[model samples]
Target: NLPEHWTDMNHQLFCMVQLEPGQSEYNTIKDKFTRTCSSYAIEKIERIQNAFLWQSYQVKKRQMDIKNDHKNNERLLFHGTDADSVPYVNQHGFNRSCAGKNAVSYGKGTYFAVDASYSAKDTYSKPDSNGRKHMYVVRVLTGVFTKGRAGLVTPPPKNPHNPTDLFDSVTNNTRSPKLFVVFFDNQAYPEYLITFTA
Candidate 1:
């Protein structure tokens, strides 16, 4: 037996499989799910297409040598500070919401940097008169295991500033920290070095 919440529309779709079903008010709900599913599929297709295009472009640019050029040598990392650390009265802030908000590192190596700043809602407030500020550093590593499919290795007890300097920070370091990677568009993929302080 179907659940009590099942509506007539649900029964109809469960029964009718051959022909186009009659439209109903509930069809709007069905249409929404159908559209969302279709959109997700399209997005996946686009991602694959873009990855392929990028690979192809790199291949041509290197004259098919593909041996020495920095084609897939890209990586990304995200680091951020928590908003709660800021000392402001009722001054809502960002970057504290997520683990990687105020500062995040991206890419295989540390070669990029980004600093983010958000003004307090009320500058006149004595506590928040200075507003909030954050800073971050990005570095890139070469010949290092920056990108991989395996699960992320445990981070060292002490955070290392340089991507290449991993030995002194973590003890019994059997594995290396893998680089984070993301694909946004067909031709461009930029990683961030985020940092925020208040």
Candidate 2:
């Protein structure tokens, strides 16, 4: 039997499956959204079902876990984007080619935030023509991150003198990172889309 949240339209496209209000998945996502930015009202929560992107994320995650001795430091993070970019991201996955589309103060890579409020800003998640805003709950492979700097296209070497030994990602802070930046295309996967009005 199919899951309760599985929609009939899923059989046709299966790309974006919307979750019902009472479903556990829906409740979990709703809790996460409101916890960091509790004032907004979520309109809908949709699960992303991109087979290729999921496989690519898993492949990279597994490789890092194996190579790093199970220290991949995977985390679920938030990314906010314009409505126009949603379809492109859903179909092609997050790309570093669009790095400067938002903030590039940390680094010239795809950025993910630790707090929902950071991504919820109008500067990042602009309202659509319909006044609806969107944010993504992303799976990020943030193995070993170091403080990032402006104009950084790729993560710097862990040791300035070392070759072939670089950090996997870049962060706003080395002590307690708030924003993470990844240079690789497959380093993060858009797992869920939350449409809301703040």
Candidate 3:
């Protein structure tokens, strides 16, 4: 269903997005540098409903587009992961604080994004009557270069940080899920501790 707050401009904006390789002859500056990408390959998820289920269609479409774009290329580094609100208390005498880093950290070489996770569950302390909740999947992705740091001669970044340049090259080579949906969670709500994989 179209969101009650949804507007026509919202629908029209996506239509204007030119998704093919190459550019128009009318725009000579189109190829001045590199190709384009999106901040979130699939951004609007909740609004993914219409008679055609517009939201899900877009997500699946982007998945296909990225797949096809990289079919002739290994050119996108996809970025994941889970656990509960565990470490549930300050039980023992706690002298715990991050000196220089956050409680959780990932590799410094990757760019990461977390989707609004959506799962249904109760607390670990309360304990679900039915064992563990079957974690529904959510995929987030992007990245920089490795060789850029290796040896001694540092190379510049693979690309600038733009949605149009949002594709990462690292994970693109591996045979992974076609959708890039690497995460599974049983709870989709606010205030959750997710181990972000970089």
Candidate 4:
């Protein structure tokens, strides 16, 4: 058996997977980002300030090396578009919803759509509003361990202040804490595979 906080050999990153303020896990009204792993403990998570339960997860973004991915039966599910039938990680999609978010170093089985990137310049940049500084991403076995699959994400079309992949011909070359990039070497993907094609 593995440790209580890890997969076979993948490394984990720690982050806060909070349920946000004024929200109940057992909401009678289910929204797009709401689902259960099969249990409900109310009043339990309510009123807990910050309500943040720090945890660890294997990956932080939503890019998959599909050709070499499925054979492994990766646990992260959901293609985000009609490409697949899996549901979403948060009831509402996108990371800005920091309101409805998941953590790579953490888990609750939710597909947090992303496009994080890293730049050699920003490699020395400080962490952002969320404390995600410029760091290399260890490969995450996407869709291998959970039902919440990562999905294709679009980083900003342009940003001088924040680039996505510096080596990229697009997105000012993005990077880590850089917004869910699937094309970087740090993520340990095939570099040849991409998030969207055809």
Candidate 5:
């Protein structure tokens, strides 16, 4: 029942045992069955080994470390919302977008880091009128901010043409202060978009 590859050896051994169940023959069959079972166990062990290798590759693809400096009084902040909801900005009007009008004043201590593992699989086709496609995104913002200051000392400007470069500039110049995440799924109907405030 465990599947063909798993049980084929066992079935063969069982058939041989059924053919002759005497003590001498039974012992022989038992030994054979045990050997077959051991072989199956070895195969499983190999599979586990392969799975571990694959897991390592995936971990390398999306792994990151956040070093903490407790002696320096540094703490990380994380903020996020469910689908169709705007990100929560502080009273000073800092929103999630790296380059928003209100960007200067907010996220002084926050750092942007993406949840690399966060991904979406689209199942809906374009022609399907009722099909819903899930959209998943992870946005991380990083920067240093004064403890009480509403405004942040902005980093240098990045090339406008390359969005990835722009994002990288923010990451390199900014300190990891906070993280935010969002996910959504929809078809045709638009949800009320929220805004960051002043």
Candidate 6:
């Protein structure tokens, strides 16, 4: 039997399954996306099936749960990317090296936008030659965060007194932040891909 989360689809190491418009998964993403970015039309959403990545995400989530005294601060966030990077992300997961391709003001790590509108901008998710764009609905482990700054390659210590215990991620603001930057390669997973147009 597959994991509870995998029950809806055929088990696969890596693949993309298109979600029907009325399906719960599809509606959730459409609602989350369209409410904030009404100008764009969501043409389709495909569930990403990467067993390896899902396992890695589960392990990371468990680790964070224990570290935070049984609290897991996971969120389904958005990451806008170019059409060129779609295949690579679908196969190998998000590559941290590509962080600099966009703005690195938060930190020199992979960035996720809390608001779909932010990523829908041409600054992060550029339109393809045909004027189409792609964005990812990713599962991000934002265990704990601290205010981010320019040129930060990793998260700072959670507390100045404890140099070894660093924050799990960095953000534009500790409170009411609009973006999150995760340094670890496995801290985020590409869960779904949305092909749309502005």
Off by over 4 Å in 2: 1-14, 101-104
1 or 2: which has the higher lDDT? 2
* lDDT (10s digit) by residue, model 4, range 104-132: 32221212222222111122223344432
lDDT of 1: 0.24
* Model 4 weakest 10-residue run by lDDT: 189-198
lDDT of each: 0.24, 0.84, 0.24, 0.23, 0.23, 0.84
Ranking by TM-score: 6, 2, 3, 1, 4, 5
Q: Specify the highest-TM-score model's number.
A: 6
What TM-score would every model get versus the actual structure? 0.19, 0.90, 0.23, 0.19, 0.17, 0.92
* Model 3, TM vs. native: 0.23
Distance (Å) between predicted and true CA of 195, model 6? 0.3
lDDT by residue for model 2 (1-198), tens: 333443454444346978889989899888888888898889998998776777788889888887775584698899989998999989888888875544547778898998988889988889998889999999999998888888788898888878568788989888888899998888898989999995
Model 4 segments more than 4 A misplaced: 1-118, 127-133, 139-198
lDDT of 5 at 147: 24
lDDT of 4 at 129: 46
lDDT of 6 by residue, 5-64 (tens): 654555446768888988888998999998789999988899888888888888888888
lDDT agreement of model 4 with the native = 0.23
Count: clashes, candidate 5? 14
Better of 1 and 2 by TM-score: 2
